[PDB]
Amino acid sequence: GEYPTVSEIPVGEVRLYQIADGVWSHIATQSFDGAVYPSNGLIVRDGDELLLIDTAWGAKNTAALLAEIEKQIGLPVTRAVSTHFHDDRVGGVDVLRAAGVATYASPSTRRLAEVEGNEIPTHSLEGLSSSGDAVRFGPVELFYPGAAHSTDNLVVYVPSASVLYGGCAIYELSRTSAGNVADADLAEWPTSIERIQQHYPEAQFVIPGHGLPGGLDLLKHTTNVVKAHTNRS
């Protein structure tokens, strides 16, 4: 009802939606395969500065993201984390770096991003290489649930607000079929999701990579969709 949709967001623009105190999602609309969809990332306040989760796909959009943050929040983004290596999550990293933002990702993501020719976050996030690994990063906890949408995908939990951002490892309810699974691990995706359920059973707000937020139901929904795809179809 209040959450921004593609109808409110022209391609190239960015909206912010405050989930809780000091926690926002940033929403940007992207063109793909001739379709337009809303892409989610996360913003989390940390003291008097901001932690960014994922870009807005590309230089232009990521510049628009920084401008929307300054307009609505007005605190500096000092650090940024990319949840996996695909261009829509690391695209814009160069703009962030040039603006003075410290960019972060796992060695797995940086590795894969380089092979793909994508932009590469400067700093490496250690202690996330094994499935089930969790590390604290300021106002959030980074978690590697195992392979799913990609072998390197991370999810982000904000303990102060009980917010779980799943990136493309989590589907919105409106998504009834599998998205881009070229780099996915269909055999492991359900198991990885269950690691998330087990580790964050208290989560109250779940943010999918694309589309509308919900509750923990989005996990079982995603599993249902992934399994249906596996059985083809």
CA distances in angstroms from 127 to 102, 124, 131, 133, 140, listed in the order given: 19, 10, 10, 7, 15
**Could you confirm whether 149 is annotated as catalytic?**
yes
CA-nearest of 69, 46, 74 to 158 is 46
Contact 162, 176 (CB under 8 A): no
Least distance (Å) between residue 207 CB and Zn ion: 15
- Residues 81, 89: Cα–Cα separation, whole Å: 9
Least distance (Å) between residue 79 CB and Cl ion: 7
**Binding-site residue total for a copy of itself (CB under 8 A)?**
24
Q: Is 48 annotated as a binding residue?
A: yes
Give the footprint of Zn ion on this chain (CB under 5 A): 86, 102, 168
**Binding-site residue total for ligand OH (CB under 6 A)?**
4
Rounded to the nearest 5°, which phi and psi values hold at 158? -105, 100
CA 7 to chain centroid, in Å, comes to 21
The residues in 118-147 that bind Cl ion, with binding defined as CB under 5 A, are: 122
Least distance (Å) between residue 170 CB and a copy of itself: 12
**Could you confirm whether 26 is annotated as catalytic?**
no
Q: Is 13 annotated as a binding residue?
A: yes
Beta-sheet strands, E only, within 23-105: 23-32, 35-46, 49-53, 77-81, 102-105
Amino acid present at 181: V
- Residues 170, 186: Cα–Cα separation, whole Å: 13
**Could you confirm whether 180 is annotated as catalytic?**
yes
Write each residue from 143 to 182 as x if it is in contact with a copy of itself (CB under 8 A), else as -, in one continuous string: ----------------------------xx-xxxx-x--x
Partner touching 102 among ligand OH, a copy of itself, Zn ion, none, CB below 5 to 8 Å by kind: Zn ion
Helix axis angle, 217-231 to 189-199, nearest 10°? 170
Partner touching 86 among Cl ion, Zn ion, a copy of itself, none, CB below 5 to 8 Å by kind: Zn ion
Q: Is 123 annotated as a binding residue?
A: yes
Residues annotated within a binding site: 1, 13, 48, 84, 86, 88, 123, 139, 149, 168, 172, 210, 221
| Residues in contact with ligand OH by the rule CB under 6 A | 86, 88-89, 168
Residues annotated within a binding site for Mg(2+): 1, 13, 139, 172
